């Protein structure tokens, strides 16, 4: 049918500062198998309601996929604020779509901490909706030059999550998938039955 069950049943997953998008088309997707999920800790929707999606056709779904800390899931909602919404992945205040998340402690936590997953800590200004920034520019927090490597008052702009086993449920890794929908009057290769 469609890639959704493979985006969910995926082995590898992306860091939120470099959040990875799938364009969906050519499609006929069963959203009821998604909302039937026993793993999904979160399945928020905005504009739409889960049982309605087999009635709604669309031009395009974007499925956006990334890993964040389990309490930062709060920030993956329309118009929110906090480090992830402000500096990594912003949903617009008029977002239509769904936010799916589940605890991935068994995949993404590693002993002594998994340092492979990162988020952007430093940005001169907040992100626009659906903006992305993959840069490694050394962050000039000082009034003086900083010139390509970190030191006195300047920094590598990413921070590693270090995801531990145990260590409290809100602090465990959560895989997040966001389903976003788009319309310009043409070629609806997405529907239900």
């Amino acid at each position, epitope marked *: 049918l469609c890639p959704f069950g493979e985006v969910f049943n995926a082995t590898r997953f992306a860091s939120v500062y470099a959040w990875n998008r799938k364009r969906i088309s050519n499609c006929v997707a069963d959203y009821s198998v998604l909302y039937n999920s026993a793993s999904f800790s979160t399945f928020k929707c905005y504009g739409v309601s889960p049982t309605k999606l087999n009635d709604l056709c669309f031009t395009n779904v974007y499925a956006d996929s990334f890993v964040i800390r389990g309490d930062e899931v709060r920030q993956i909602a329309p118009g929110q604020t906090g*480090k992830i919404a*402000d500096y990594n992945y912003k949903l617009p205040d008029d977002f239509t779509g769904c936010v799916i998340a589940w605890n991935s402690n068994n995949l993404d936590s590693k002993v002594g*901490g998994n340092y492979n997953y990162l988020y952007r800590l430093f*940005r*001169k200004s907040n992100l626009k909706p659906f903006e992305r920034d993959i840069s490694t520019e050394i*962050y000039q927090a000082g009034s003086t030059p900083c010139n390509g490597v970190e030191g006195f*008052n300047c920094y590598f702009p990413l921070q590693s999550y270090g995801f531990q086993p145990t*260590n409290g449920v809100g*602090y465990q890794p959560y895989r997040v998938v966001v389903l976003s929908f788009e319309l310009l009057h043409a070629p609806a290769t997405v529907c239900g039955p």
Partner: antibody
Amino acid sequence: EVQVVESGGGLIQPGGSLRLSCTASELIISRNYMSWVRQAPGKGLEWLSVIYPGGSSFYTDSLKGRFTISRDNSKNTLYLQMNRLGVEDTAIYYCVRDAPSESDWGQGTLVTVSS
Amino acid sequence: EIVLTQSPATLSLFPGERATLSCRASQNIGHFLTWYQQKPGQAPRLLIYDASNRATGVPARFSGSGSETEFTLTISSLGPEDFAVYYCQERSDWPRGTFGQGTKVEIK
């Protein structure tokens, strides 16, 4: 070492309001995470409020709507508008700048509230 | 919300001795914890971050140990200048978060 330097310390009363200020020697206050923290005589540290680099700002439940953090990027300065006080809001207030491995505190400034 | 308990309230060791300062958390806060020094009349100073890393310019005698719900600042030998108040803070919503009530060192 970087010096961050509070100002606007002084006296008020029950009913009234005040506004603190801070400046920084070799860092840009708009680019940094900046907070206010207070320490009353004979009491522990209370973290008050923060402004993130992109201007997002947050507050402790003890003071939501009483105090309001803000900055001016042009003056390289930070402000705590501090309204509707009581006698117990008397403390040293510290301006503090944070980075992942570093936390730079100003010398602190007194505020007192009484008759 | 999280609250932090420090033990002891006042330590009373002599200079030269190895010292341990203890912090316990009302929640499992992972590694997200800070320790600060404070001399009387000075502002606080960062010692330890992420339960265990040592901040730049802090002498190598300081160390951080423990995780999750139980944490300890440890000093390999007290200098006479290490007599101070010490505060833990949870930084699980960095840079925000609650402080401990603090611990002193004093003798006679």
